[PDB]
Symmetry: D2
């Protein structure tokens, strides 16, 4: 039982100076070459244990799922200040949400239908653009947001509805925090980071208006409600409950954060498909063969479209939008691969390192739907595929998201083809911002009706 090996940390800086000018991801890869799949790295004076590769990450998040399932200190209540009670009530709330979330996919109106409706409204908008050159960011935030809106408030919004615009602004609107390296070293010496959520005034711009809107919908909802026949999330909340309107803000927030990842995946997907017209075609042909140019694509179609499915896996794999996964905390002294990780140690499951694992993918860095296709061109599981993560806290939205990706993706290409000022050979898929995320470069595209 030794602790995981790693580079020796400096006082105050930890291993900060052992990062490449080439990025955090490369640095992690370099460390991994040196020390192996489980190594320890120091941020400030704090140890974090870093998991790399499909096998290590799956042994941790799946085989010792419970041990590797803790949250960060920011999310741990102090019973000396708040009592137990909020602790247990949060537990129950979480489980209620974890449960209801599953229910939407099983039911039952249905999520597939709401997404189909939304895809229709989308195709219509794309015609209105009459093949002009656009940035799809806003459009893709809109179509994925509405799926949440329909599920929570019961009904989708209109793309130009000023509440829906205000809520797109609250949740998706960037703001930035300015730092310098001298300040960062002083933060490390302090023990405290300068930035924390809500330090930017912008956040509050739209908050109260959104809050108020929620109040109204809870009321309009309460007026008409009948268990055990709950319509949307709002009136499920009312039953469970039977101040707190803020529980809804919180849940909506969580769902929008996943939705942002969903929207960015589509936006990245369409960048890839500009770069690879031949793939756009085989997808157009598989839609022809399976759906025709008549009906809208449906979820049952996916099973009969292994090439479109492989293509979407591959879009999520290279898009790698959450490259360090979400850090967790170990809940107890844990034996792992011949080392010991002490209770409460912070862990990074580096998902990027699975999604690019050379033991699981033939060309880890090259678009290759063949990663998900067998000899007979059927869909095959690949164990390195884990963009929603794994185990006890696997993405709550996996199903909603995978479903949005399929319907929006085929429905768009069934009705349109794409083009841009940039020649395939010259599309650059490398992330503009590569810190803790992999945000796709912004680009222009034109949606031309196949009709």
């Amino acid at each position: 039982g030794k602790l995981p090996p790693g580079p020796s940390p400096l006082p105050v800086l930890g291993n900060l100076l052992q990062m490449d000018r080439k990025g955090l991801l490369r640095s992690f890869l370099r460390l991994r070459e040196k020390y192996g799949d489980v190594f320890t790295v120091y941020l400030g004076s704090r140890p974090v244990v870093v998991l790399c590769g499909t096998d290590a990450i799956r042994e941790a998040l799946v085989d010792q799922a419970e041990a590797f399932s803790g949250r960060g200190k920011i999310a741990v209540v102090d019973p000396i200040f708040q009592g137990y009670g909020v602790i247990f009530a949060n537990g129950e709330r979480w489980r209620a949400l974890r449960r209801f979330s599953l229910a939407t996919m099983r039911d039952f109106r249905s999520v597939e239908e709401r997404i189909q409706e939304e895809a229709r409204c989308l195709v219509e908008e794309l015609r209105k653009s009459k093949g002009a050159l656009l940035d799809n960011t806003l459009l893709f935030h809109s179509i994925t947001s509405n799926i949440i809106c329909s599920i929570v408030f019961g009904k989708r919004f209109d793309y130009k509805d000023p509440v829906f615009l205000r809520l797109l602004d609250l949740f998706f609107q960037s703001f930035s925090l300015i730092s310098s390296f001298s300040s960062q070293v002083f933060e490390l010496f302090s023990g405290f980071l300068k930035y924390f959520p809500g330090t930017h005034r912008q956040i509050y711009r739209n908050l109260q208006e959104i809050n108020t809107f929620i109040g109204q919908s809870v009321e309009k909802h309460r007026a008409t409600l009948d268990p055990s026949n709950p319509r949307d999330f709002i009136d499920v909340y009312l039953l469970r409950m039977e101040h707190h309107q803020n529980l809804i803000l919180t849940v909506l927030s969580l769902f929008f954060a996943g939705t942002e990842t969903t929207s960015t995946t589509l936006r990245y997907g369409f960048l890839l498909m500009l770069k690879y017209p031949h793939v756009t075609e085989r997808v157009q042909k598989e839609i022809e063969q399976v759906i025709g140019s008549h009906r809208p694509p449906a979820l049952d179609d996916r099973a009969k479209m292994p090439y479109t499915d492989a293509v979407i896996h591959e879009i999520q794999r290279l898009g790698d939008l959450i490259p360090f996964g979400v850090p967790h905390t170990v809940t107890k002294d844990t034996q792992f691969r011949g080392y010991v990780i002490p209770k409460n140690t912070e862990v990074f499951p580096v998902l990027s390192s699975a999604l690019h694992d050379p033991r699981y993918f033939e060309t880890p860095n090259t678009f290759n739907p063949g990663h998900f296709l067998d000899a007979n061109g059927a869909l095959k599981r690949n164990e390195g595929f884990m963009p929603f993560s794994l185990g006890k806290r696997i993405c709550l939205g996996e199903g909603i998201a995978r479903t949005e990706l399929f319907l929006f993706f085929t429905t768009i290409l069934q009705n349109f083809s794409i083009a841009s000022p940039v020649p395939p050979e010259d599309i650059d898929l490398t992330p503009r911002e590569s810190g803790v995320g992999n945000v796709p470069p912004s680009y222009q595209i034109r949606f031309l009706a196949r009709h």
Copy 2:
């Protein structure tokens, strides 16, 4: 109420008190809470309590009267002996103390800091002539002049303003880069228990790091061969002496540059004020006259004979309020404070902005007013609410070097120049472009016209 915890607004699950902030910023938000709950109250960031200290009296009772209890660092800076053993822990203690002590030699002592500043002051005057009265942004200039003081002290000699090592080092330490967030991401961070932002996530930083590091290696060498006690030529060979790992120097340099940046920004703010108040620039120009003539360069001993220029610099620091929430600390033991109890390890914000604007100590908290530091006979007077370097066990290690830079740079500049800008006094706006945890002065233009 035997021993209660400090009162505060009720927190929401996950968000804490995040929705209890104003569209008008944290500082207002805090002041509002203060009105409601008093000088010591509890606020929740995520699920974590932080106890907030407001007003001169509370802040002084904590940081001074219970200095030790209020002296801890945040968790990021606490070593885990399970991972690293004790030893590094005690070594850092010793290193910190050595550095704390070394800070005073500048204080009491081959050539002096005051001298080093005067020399820098001269080079500056020269540079300003070269401007020839053109409009310029003084950011870079002020970073340069204050940075050099640290360079002279550490490497033994100042740099040339266009020396490409010094430009590279200005870039490492002072160059802004930004981290992009959204509100939905932030609420997900709170839910996670972890922040996305942490030092070094921006790739920019490494741009100049290795080059700076190598340069340090070289100076440690050139130092090691020539050097010998007890003739500590500068900080580099003070480090060699103690030592008989270069990265220890990078760390110390880093710390001094962070305080320097605040020093430079204070000057930059100071001059914006002085554009807005020409009448004060004049009384300062006049005081320098009685005191110093127009030929010799100002010296530190002049400060005691210039209460109006002193008071004016206090007042620049007060309103500049560049570290409004102080530096968060941690309580080292269960502590009784003003009728409440703060548990061991609780995080604490000493809100220095609230002492610097304390109505009980400053007649016009929000208005430039040298009278705040002057008595009836226009002599300098202590004001208790004045605490921009903080107080107590961890008072700014640079307080001396900084106060000294501010005096020599401000008087030496005004002795040789006068200032002007496209913007009419009435229209200069001193409100911080962005605050965040900072109160950053709006960028502006200014002209330095040689006096003759």
Copy 3:
């Protein structure tokens, strides 16, 4: 979410002054009347949560088995001083022992055979006493000890073998620690107790000799031994063998502590049977009807003797030899009957209060085999019967001990009858020492050969 209610503690003394002249057990009962089945009591400045009644003890030890399974601070390794490693190894050792113990019960000779053999050697000894008045303490320690010797060393000892006498002395020989109330108050104020194991010099009297004997047996064992013929625990140890001998000393220690309880249960059992001769008769008659006076009793007989079984249950229930159970520790913040018990809080499962639960026994305080018999005089389960405790840490020896109690009790009474200077009406079953235990009064008894 409130903590369990209880009496207000004084500084330093805690609730010490809230105890009766009438004893700890009654004091708690008075407290239970006042506060309910779950209450908080202070020893020194430390809270301990006390569980009373069959329902609460079963809801904690069984329904939340894991949460209520922790050990006291004295048994918790500090990884700062010893690393993890010893921690995990002890976990593995414990489970290996937990396992082999169950296996042996299932099993060149069965455990039951070894107890049968020992019952024979006992019967013989009782004849050599030729009906003389004796104190059976030593005899009952001997017969139960040998069962452990045979299992660990492979073969039983001779009752006068001087190794075995030395062994009996180490493990079972009383020594005492002297205290005053003024010293005790000073200990509480100190935060430290004076007593700790091994402060009495007497312990070492026989330790090295015993240790050496173990060495020898490990050797004599290592020479001969081989699967698929493990002869006993010693060579099981050798086999899992794949600083060292002392692991046997430790296990032997543990087994002798439960053995002592077993021996004391027989000794208490025979006291009861002096007091209720008719009961001894019905037992003699059920042995007649079922075993006869020819063969030795066997374990399969027990199923066919519900009266003797019910009478042994009742002996264990009233004997109440471990009335506070063994304190445990709570492993996490726990919800329990409307309260919260914080992580690490010490917990007393007060077994005596189950064994005397008026909700489960008609006459809690009166010998009554009817507690375990139905209308047709068949054996019936009683939920308040838990003298081995319950749940994840139920007595490791439950099976060996129940089997010793049956064969030794029937085998003795099949061959002897009992008598004493004291008239039934005058036998007093109240414990001479009512500390944290319930030690039966010492007495004299004669065994007489039956005919």
Copy 4:
């Protein structure tokens, strides 16, 4: 650099228990010391305790790092989750107050010295009533020292046969025993819990409520009579503090208990003292002669006499040094990560300051194991300090009773020998001063002695 203190490798469950001698814990610790040095780590169960040996180590810990080594054990630590803070600070204020009230000097209704002097006279009288018979002085010594506390607390001394006083002697001083076996002890270690805890013995409650009641009445009677500024004793000091303002009468029980625990050690010191003096008649004589030269046979000894009697003083020091009644000191707890002699002791580590090892430090006493008044006397026969002398411990928690106790030892000891001489059946060569058990205590063997009136 900063490694933990060295020690013997512990076994699972048992810790270092098998590394103890048949020869007792103290010898076991001395053997480890030889092997590992003055600071070493030993394991009780799975719990590390750092052991401090020698005058120098114990003084560097309790004195030079006084605060760091001043913690109490877990039993005495409040969990604020259950009790809040408040009881915690109250206790602090309470400790400090008590500490303060005790620091009044020996002479100032009337002084402690006076009370002791009075008590010595009632003692002398009792020893005459024995008319030189052979007695066991245990009860007598508990009585005389107990009374000092009674006088201080209740305002007046008790009569040696007063049935309240006999009941209180019984509550506080009466032994009871807890029976254990080694197999049970190994199981306790495995459990994580000890069977023994204060109050498991029913005997304690025999006299508790009667004592409590007595305290009630006294408080009331006191309440009736207070004329501060004319405060007679501790009872109305307590009442007075409360007045500025259960915990009510219970705080007194608790304090009384604490004082009787130190009193027991004071009484056992005298009892051990007189056993030594049977063994060394020539020392009894030089003491008798120094009492002659200094006090004469006419007045009662007074405290001011001690300064003028360096031989009696040295003899009493030596009685306390070899008596060694608290050989392991009182275990403490380290309040913070602490650098000590090149090692680190982590926050909350339990510490044994082994006072026996200072009291017998060959570096400070020429003949550590032999009675030798010379340890405290210089060349001219004047008293000299010895650094290894620390039977009340040192530092922030030095015995609260040091003054009262040293004063009782001087007045009782001189007064007795001014008025009596001593004898016993056993010849001095044959007196055996080795303590009966060796387990955290060094109880002197019981013995008989005769007190023979001197008759000037």
